[PDB]
């Protein structure tokens, strides 16, 4: 019992210094525990327990006064050793572990657990209030840029973990982690509030990103996995979210000034706080919105009559913040939403719509712009075209865009300044997809006729070859009255030099289509005139009307405004406007010389005389140009027209709806009406009411007696 306790202790002591052992000697000690056990299983124990307590206690003297990277170098170098030595002791003490108690009935032995336990009674000595501080100081060092030996920290923590009763973390937390994080909260709390007071936010953002990253390796490399998602939470907590109103106010400037790579960063940073990315979206919507209203504001009046300016301004706005939402805000749907909402808001209600007193001005402009683009290069057009379809998406009064687009496309197919039939087609393809089909088809019918009219002409061209030619080069366009916006008009005495082309064709068309009949549109038909009476002789493009007049100057030379309004039988209200062009052009002069003609009160009395001589330096002058008020008159008119169709469209809906419900309640119906009409426009409620009314008068609906605000369909 003591005959062994001595040599066994000899070995124990050798095993605890680090003197290599002999395979035989390891076993000798094993043997001693074997015999001491297979003879007391608490005597050998306590004696081992003593040897340990009276080993560590002594060791402590070697560090009691060590203090910085030294208790660290000390405590760790001592731990690594004590561990292995005990692993070996635990090895010899097999029989003390196993018979003397319970086995076979996990890396927990008691003899080793006996070693761990006594040492933690070495941990309370230096560590708790020291070896831990030395660590926090060293970590602080590395955080201030000081390259450090991380193994002085690893060793410590790994110890703590194991000195627990991997799963047990009390000691770790209680004697280190808790203080670690606390120190971290303050360290970063202090670094941030000081950097911000001394640096531009764009720079604090760069740093915070960095620190966060640094603190990552600072756990993966020398801390326990346990403290991972907490050091992270805490760091973001102090590095990112107590600085959100600072981040917020700056979010602005980072937009007020197009410095958008930082926006990406702020994004990636707030993208770390729960719901933190919310207020960013709000601020953006508001921003891009005001940003849009401003753009338009600064275009003043021009914008009101410059479609390119207008559409290009909106386009510029959107195109900026889109590619901005793509990179910077990682194409986040939540953000795409802000942009959309903002664009939808300003595109429909802005400075132009305001002064025009109607949101419908935007859609018309968009439509006009399209027209400009399709009149007489590729990348821009197909793209520009494509951008147009983007804007459209946001327009709410879409029927308006549609009416104008057709109204203007039509004035094109006929007369002039249409680009390649390609863009034209390509733009149809684009509408086929956004716009409906009833719409797309309506347009198709227009193209059909033009083609049909084309072939029709090639027929007549022959009919003339096959007989008596005409006194001029004639061509016509027969358009189905129903499919075109055109309206015949201004009464008109047709000059003689044409009458042959007229009858000659009329007869022909009548021979081609028996059941049909033609109604000629002079306000929309032109021709080429030749001048064999001036210094130089030229060909001038001229509206029929203009020709109807000029041709009169083939007899006398002056004609009172009345002498004309009588002859050509072309209307004064309008006949006057034409003359003004003819004057400003310079083929007519009133009487006097000074030309304040641009703004005169040409009364019936006033004379209009042919001017002989001088003329355009060129040989082909196009005297046919828009009467000024002409456009403003067509515009206001097509709107007026849209006002009508709207009510008619509304009722159509009211009906088919009440026709497939037999009874509905006021609201019920209004909701329906909207749902359908939504893709085209937003029927003002008072109007659907004034509509449901007229249907009651037209006897398509009747109120449900014994139930006001409920309607029944009257078959």
């Amino acid at each position: 019992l003591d005959q062994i306790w001595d040599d066994l202790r000899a070995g124990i002591q050798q095993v605890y210094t680090r003197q290599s052992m002999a395979k035989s000697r390891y076993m000798e000690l094993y043997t001693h525990v074997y015999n001491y056990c297979t003879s007391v299983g608490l005597e050998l124990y306590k004696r081992l327990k003593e040897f340990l307590k009276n080993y560590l206690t002594n060791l402590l003297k070697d560090g009691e006064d060590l203090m910085d990277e030294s208790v660290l170098k000390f405590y760790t170098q001592q731990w690594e050793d004590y561990r292995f030595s005990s692993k070996v002791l635990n090895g010899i003490c097999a029989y003390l572990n196993r018979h003397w108690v319970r086995r076979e009935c996990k890396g927990i032995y008691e003899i080793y657990s006996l070693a761990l336990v006594t040492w933690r009674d070495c941990l309370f000595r230096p560590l708790n209030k020291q070896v831990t501080n030395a660590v926090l100081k060293l970590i602080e060092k590395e955080r201030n840029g000081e390259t450090i030996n991380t193994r002085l920290i690893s060793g410590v923590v790994q110890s703590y973990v194991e000195l627990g009763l991997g799963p047990t973390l009390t000691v770790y937390k209680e004697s280190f982690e808790s203080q670690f994080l606390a120190d971290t909260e303050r360290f970063y709390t202090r670094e941030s509030t000081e950097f911000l007071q001394q640096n531009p936010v764009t720079e604090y953002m760069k740093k915070a990103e960095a620190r966060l990253l640094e603190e990552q390796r600072r756990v993966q490399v020398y801390l326990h996995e346990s403290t991972q998602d907490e050091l992270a939470r805490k760091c973001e907590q102090v590095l990112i979210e107590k600085h959100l109103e600072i981040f917020h106010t700056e979010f602005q400037n980072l937009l007020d000034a197009d410095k958008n790579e930082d926006l990406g960063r702020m994004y990636n940073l707030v993208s770390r706080i729960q719901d933190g990315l919310g207020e960013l979206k709000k601020l953006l919507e508001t921003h891009i919105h005001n940003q849009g209203l401003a753009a338009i504001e600064k275009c003043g009046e021009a914008a009101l009559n410059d479609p390119k300016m207008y559409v290009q301004t909106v386009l510029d706005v959107h195109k900026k913040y889109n590619a901005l939402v793509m990179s910077a805000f990682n194409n986040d749907a939540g953000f795409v939403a802000a942009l959309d909402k903002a664009c939808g808001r300003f595109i429909n209600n802005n400075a132009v719509t305001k002064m025009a007193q109607s949101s419908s001005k935007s859609p018309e402009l968009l439509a006009r712009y399209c027209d400009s683009l399709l009149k007489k290069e590729e990348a821009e057009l197909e793209d520009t075209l494509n951008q147009v379809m983007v804007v459209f998406k946001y327009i709410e009064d879409k029927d308006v865009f549609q009416k104008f687009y057709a109204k203007m496309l039509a004035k094109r197919l006929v007369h002039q300044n249409s680009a390649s039939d390609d863009a034209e087609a390509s733009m149809i393809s684009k509408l086929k997809q956004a716009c409906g089909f009833e719409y797309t088809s309506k347009l198709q019918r227009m193209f059909q006729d033009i083609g049909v009219s084309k072939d029709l002409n090639e027929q007549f061209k022959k009919h003339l070859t096959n007989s008596e030619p005409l006194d001029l080069d004639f061509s016509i366009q027969v358009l189905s009255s129903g499919s075109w916006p055109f309206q015949q008009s201004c009464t008109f005495a047709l000059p003689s030099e044409l009458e042959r082309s007229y009858q000659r064709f009329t007869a022909f068309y009548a021979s081609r289509h028996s059941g049909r009949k033609l109604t000629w549109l002079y306000q929309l038909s032109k021709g080429e005139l030749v001048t064999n009476c001036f210094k130089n002789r030229y060909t001038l493009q001229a509206s029929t009307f203009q020709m109807a007049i000029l041709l009169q100057y083939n007899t006398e030379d002056a004609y009172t405004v009345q002498q004309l309004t009588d002859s050509t039988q072309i209307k004064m209200d309008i006949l006057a406007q034409v003359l003004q062009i003819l004057l400003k052009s310079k083929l007519l002069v009133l009487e006097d010389e000074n030309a304040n003609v641009d703004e005169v009160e040409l009364k019936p009395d006033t004379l209009i005389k042919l001017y002989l001589g001088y003329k355009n330096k060129k040989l082909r002058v196009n005297i046919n140009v828009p009467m000024k008020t002409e456009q403003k008159q067509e515009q206001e008119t097509t709107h007026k027209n849209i006002e009508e169709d709207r009510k008619l469209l509304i009722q159509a809906a009211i009906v088919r709806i009440m026709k497939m419900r037999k009874v509905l309640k006021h609201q019920q119906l209004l909701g329906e009406v909207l749902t359908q009409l939504s893709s085209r426009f937003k029927p003002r409620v008072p109007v659907i009411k004034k509509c449901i009314d007229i249907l009651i008068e037209k006897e398509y609906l009747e109120r449900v007696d014994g139930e006001k605000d409920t309607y029944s369909y009257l078959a």
């Binding site: 290599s20 052992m21 203090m67 303050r186 490399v221 275009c299 390509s426 709806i657 497939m660």
Partner: protein
């Protein structure tokens, strides 16, 4: 529902358009919610019906039908969806017509509405149909629409059809020939969208096909097509160009007007394909064809050139000189006018150049100057152009220009002003122009000595003063912004002038009150107005009519909005403390209290500014202060003295420091919360700098006041109270700093100071805490005042050097060190003295000395420098290896003082000397590397290598210390490493290896312990690599790095956790050299997650692997988050055991 669908289909053939419409409406409302009631019959009927209605005699219905397809597809068995498509793709060729068009639209709809498993065949089947369609089949119409679909689909769902691509391409290419050109376009579009999905096998057949057919056959189309892919691909065409570039040029010569396209090519080529340097070949051509006008059609040429020059200049920054020195300044300015559109592109190009120059032999900016007068001469002719668009360019130019060179236009204000003024008048509804001009002018006046504008004031005001009173506000705001600067131009208060501004005061001031006194105009205008007026007051005020008091009143008033309010505060902070000691007496009365009022709006900005204002006032308007005003503020303070907002805290502490500076008396009230709140702020871990400095300046000016229950001794007890009764290290440091402050203020000392030793010596039961605050106080105080008196202390301080507590022991080291500065000759010799005498205190004493050297004085130290240095060159007695560091840290600090005559000295112990001498020196130089750029940096950048690229291969721990010094530099100033990488790196990697000779075993029975002396140096090697990662990463041979990273995955546990992370870093950063060696990096990562441990192990033994295993997945994970081209190698062996890993790692 159920009977629904039945009743609907009937109403769907209802002869009455309305019903068929409402029936189809009500049917679609249903097909949207939960795809319920699907009979595998009700479908048959429904679909067949919808497809039928697709041909209804009424458009309204037809439409609904097509709009029905969308929601349908996603609500019926896979064959029925097969049907649809098929049925749709077939009508495509229908001999009716309207069927081909609506069937066409129908198709597109389905396509758009989709995804994942669904869209499989859904495009697949289709793809086949379009193919035969796209074949030149002598029906364009069919093609053209198929090509659209082919394009609409290929891209919204490109991720797949991968196996159809080669089949797609093979039907497209021949179309690039189509006699109808529209088809050629449509096709190119397809190709473009095609390459977005490729695969890596197809980007080449396509290109080659294009390079090949470069056989002089008419129609430069293959041209556009090249450019086309360039924009889409770019990257994917960056390894195909040597043949490209030349082919293009060779053709560019050909004198045609669609030659623009080649430029279009070179442009699109050189705007996406960066690493493709044929820059010059290009610049040259552009510039030559950039003035291609003759006497038509040309111009689009000039455009492309202009557009290209614009491109180049906007990315090749490294080419600034080349830019300013070869045709562009000289030949852009040259063509700085021409047609119109083209003129515009020329300017835009230049701007990009100006912007490129914008940074942050013979510099860019210096080259720029040289450019004007040329720039100016140009603009001068432009500025007076009818085009509104052009003049705008002139202004945005000068602006950006002057924004680059803050002094740029000095020699020319006179040829510009007419230009500026001229445009401040009209060609309208262009408010942009007037605003753009108005901005330019503002920017100008902001960066140019004001003197320059004087002769021009006389003729610049009228047009400005008028813009202010312009109808539109946007113009009014700028006008007001200029006015405000215009004022500082004629009021120079910083640099006295001699310009009489009196003749402009009126008009200026007028237009402004007209705005400031409104409330109908935009707030923007309302603020620029107060701002401006404020300046109008701050700067001429002095000869300002008697319309001033009336105006000051105006402010007071305005200050009660939630808009006006903040801007006026600041404007009032500016009217105060303005040279012309302006009288704000009246407005103080009810305004001051209106200010305090603000101190409760928890609005950062307002608090800060409001406080910042209550200060100026008090400072320059003291007499007129009514005791009833001050405490009207005081009351709102306590909440402002929180550790939550230091700035606000210190801002408000400054205010009290002022109150007591110029109004003692009110002190009485400084006791309530106020006082018992600063005292709290003192006990805060967050208190530092700004506020702390103010907390100190405050006390020092509170005691001097003499006040009942607020005296010296009174306050000490308040600070040092809580401590003498029984928290945070910082607390004591701040406390001692105040104690000292309050001490150097009332030098009635000995009582306190002596009363601070029989506080330490007073060990006989004295809270270990007191001894701390005690020592720290003797320290702070000792630094300023001369304690050369009581010598009883030199020992008391040292007695603590042997305290059982670090906290005190350090505090003692500091105290002595710091006290040493109060009287440097009576203490320094003593210190060095004890350092050699009692070595038992070497460490701490060497730290005390660190404090001395560190922050002493700089004149009082030079003397002893030669002495210190001598003591430190001797203490390389390596006694404690922790001591050699304080020394090295001391040698380092010392060097800084006159480094030119000290670094060389260290760059010489280098050779001869011993392991420790060598170490110490290369360790001292380490403690020289500062975070922020310092004076030593230049010289350091030079001698650095002589320690590094030389200390990497000498011997022992010295190498380790070297690595560390290199790690320390590349982390916070690689600006001293860049050049040295080539030399260093090899070594750095060499230290990454294992020296088997530095490893011994320690056997003891079955147990063996491995000692690896190389582990630490080696750990420092990898730790250097990880650092190169954040910064210097391009100068790194990416593969040598990965070679060695591979080596350290299979190294030691402590070294694995590092590299594992290094992988995850390299995952994100540079992926391509990873995948290439992605198989070599996995064998190891696998090895780990495989390795087992014998249950003969202790509990903790296992956890280790459990943690090391899941730390490797973390990597392996991110090794899969690299373009799924990684699935290719070999890889995820689903395992029962392994499973739990990527599970708990996720």
């Amino acid at each position: 529902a159920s009977y629904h669908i039945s009743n609907l289909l009937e109403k769907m053939t209802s002869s009455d358009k309305d019903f068929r419409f409402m029936a189809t409406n009500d049917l679609m409302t249903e097909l949207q919610k939960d795809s319920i009631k699907l009979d595998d019959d009700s479908e048959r009927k429904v679909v067949k019906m919808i497809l039928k209605l697709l041909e209804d005699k009424n458009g309204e219905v037809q439409n609904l039908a097509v709009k029905c397809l969308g929601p349908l597809v996603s609500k019926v068995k896979e064959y029925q969806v097969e049907t649809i498509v098929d049925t749709l793709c077939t009508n495509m060729l229908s001999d009716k017509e309207q069927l081909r068009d609506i069937s066409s639209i129908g198709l597109k709809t389905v396509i758009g509405e989709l995804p994942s498993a669904l869209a499989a065949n859904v495009c697949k089947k289709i793809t086949g149909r379009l193919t035969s369609a796209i074949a030149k089949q002598e029906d364009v119409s069919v093609q053209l629409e198929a090509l659209d679909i082919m394009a609409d689909m290929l891209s919204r769902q490109g991720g797949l059809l991968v196996n159809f691509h080669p089949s797609i391409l093979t039907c497209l290419l021949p179309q690039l020939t189509s006699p109808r050109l529209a088809v050629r376009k449509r096709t190119i579009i397809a190709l473009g969208h095609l390459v977005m999905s490729c695969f890596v096998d197809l980007i080449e057949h396509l290109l080659s096909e294009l390079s090949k057919n470069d056989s002089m056959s008419t129609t430069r189309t293959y041209i556009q097509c090249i450019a086309a892919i360039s924009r889409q691909a770019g990257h994917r065409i960056g390894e195909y160009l040597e043949k490209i570039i030349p082919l293009v040029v060779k053709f560019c010569n050909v004198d045609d007007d669609e030659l623009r396209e080649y430029c279009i090519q070179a442009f699109e080529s050189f705007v996406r394909r960066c690493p493709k340097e044929v820059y010059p070949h290009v610049s040259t051509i552009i510039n030559i064809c950039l003035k291609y006008l003759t006497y038509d059609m040309s111009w689009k040429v000039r455009r492309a050139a202009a557009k290209c020059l614009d491109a180049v200049v906007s990315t090749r920054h490294e080419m600034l000189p080349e830019f300013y020195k070869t045709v562009s300044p000289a030949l852009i300015s040259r063509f700085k006018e021409r047609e119109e559109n083209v003129k515009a592109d020329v300017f835009h190009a230049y701007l990009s150049l100006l912007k490129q120059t914008r940074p942050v032999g013979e510099t860019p900016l210096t080259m720029l100057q040289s450019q004007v007068p040329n720039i100016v001469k140009a603009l001068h002719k432009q500025m007076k152009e009818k085009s509104v668009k052009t003049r705008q360019c002139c202004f945005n130019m000068l602006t950006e220009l002057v924004n680059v060179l803050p002094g740029a236009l000095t020699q020319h204000i006179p040829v510009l002003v007419p230009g500026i003024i001229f445009s401040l008048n009209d060609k309208s509804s262009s408010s942009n122009l007037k605003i753009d001009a108005l901005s330019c002018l503002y920017v100008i006046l902001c960066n140019h000595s004001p003197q320059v504008f004087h002769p021009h004031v006389q003729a610049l005001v009228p047009p400005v003063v008028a813009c202010v009173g312009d109808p539109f506000y946007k113009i009014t705001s700028e006008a007001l912004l200029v006015t405000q600067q215009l004022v500082k131009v004629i009021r120079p208060l910083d640099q006295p002038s001699s310009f009489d501004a009196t003749p402009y005061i009126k008009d200026l001031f007028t237009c402004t009150i007209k705005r400031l006194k409104a409330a109908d105009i935009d707030q923007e205008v309302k603020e620029r107005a107060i701002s401006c007026m404020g300046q109008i007051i701050c700067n001429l005020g002095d000869n300002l009519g008697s319309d001033l008091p009336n105006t000051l009143q105006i402010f007071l008033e305005r200050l009660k909005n939630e808009i006006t309010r903040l801007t006026t505060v600041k404007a009032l902070t500016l009217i105060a403390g303005s040279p012309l000691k302006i009288d704000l007496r009246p407005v103080l009365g009810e305004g001051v209290p209106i200010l305090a009022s603000f101190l409760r709006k928890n609005q950062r900005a307002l608090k800060l500014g409001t406080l910042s204002a209550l200060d100026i006032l008090i400072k320059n308007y003291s007499d007129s202060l009514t005791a009833a005003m001050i405490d009207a503020v005081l009351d709102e303070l306590p909440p402002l003295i929180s550790e939550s907002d230091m700035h606000v805290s210190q801002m408000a502490i400054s205010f009290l420091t002022t109150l007591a500076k110029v109004y003692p008396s009110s002190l009485s009230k400084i006791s309530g919360s106020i006082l018992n709140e600063l005292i709290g702020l003192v006990r805060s871990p967050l208190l530092q700098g700004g506020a702390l400095s103010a907390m100190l300046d405050f006390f020092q000016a509170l005691v001097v006041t003499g006040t009942n229950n607020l005296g010296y001794m009174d306050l000490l007890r308040m600070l040092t109270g809580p401590v003498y009764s029984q928290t945070h290290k910082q607390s004591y440091y701040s406390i001692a700093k105040c104690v000292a402050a309050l001490t150097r203020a009332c030098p009635k000392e000995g009582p306190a100071v002596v009363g601070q030793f029989i506080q330490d010596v007073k060990n006989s039961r004295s809270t270990d805490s007191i001894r701390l605050l005690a020592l720290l106080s003797l320290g702070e105080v000792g630094h300023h005042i001369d304690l050369s008196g009581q010598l009883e202390l030199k020992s008391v301080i040292l007695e603590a050097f042997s305290s059982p507590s670090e906290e005190v022991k350090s505090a003692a080291s500091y105290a002595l060190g710091s006290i040493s500065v109060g009287n440097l000759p009576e203490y320094l010799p003593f210190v060095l003295q004890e350092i050699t005498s009692q070595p038992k205190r070497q460490y701490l004493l060497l730290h005390s000395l660190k404090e001395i050297i560190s922050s002493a004085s700089v004149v009082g130290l030079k003397p002893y420098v030669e002495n210190i240095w001598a003591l430190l060159l001797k203490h390389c007695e390596c006694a404690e290896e922790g001591t050699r560091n304080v020394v090295a840290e001391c040698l380092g600090k010392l060097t800084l003082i006159d480094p030119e005559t000290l670094l060389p000295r260290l760059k010489g112990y280098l050779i001869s000397g011993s392991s420790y001498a060598r170490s110490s020196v290369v360790t001292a130089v380490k403690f020289t590397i500062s975070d922020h750029p310092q004076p030593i940096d230049p010289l350091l950048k030079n001698c650095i290598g002589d320690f590094l690229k030389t200390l990497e291969d000498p011997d022992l721990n010295v190498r380790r210390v070297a690595l560390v010094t290199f790690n320390s530099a590349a982390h916070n100033k690689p600006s001293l490493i860049r050049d040295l990488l080539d030399t260093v790196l090899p070594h750095l990697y060499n230290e990454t290896k294992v020296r088997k000779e530095l490893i011994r075993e320690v056997e003891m029975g079955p147990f063996k312990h491995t000692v690896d002396d190389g582990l630490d140096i080696r750990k420092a090697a990898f730790e250097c690599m990880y650092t190169l990662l954040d910064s210097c990463l391009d100068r790194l041979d990416i593969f040598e790095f990965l070679n060695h990273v591979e080596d350290g995955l299979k190294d030691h546990y402590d070294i694995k956790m590092l590299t594992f992370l290094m992988l995850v870093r390299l995952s994100t950063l540079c992926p391509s050299a990873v995948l290439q060696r992605l198989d070599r990096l996995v064998e190891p990562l696998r090895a780990t997650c495989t390795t087992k441990v014998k249950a003969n192990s202790v509990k903790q033994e296992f956890e280790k692997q459990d943690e090391l295993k899941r730390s490797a997945m973390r990597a392996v994970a991110a090794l899969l988050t690299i373009p799924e081209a990684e699935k290719s190698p070999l890889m995820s062996e689903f395992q029962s055991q392994i499973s739990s890993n990527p599970e708990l790692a996720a």
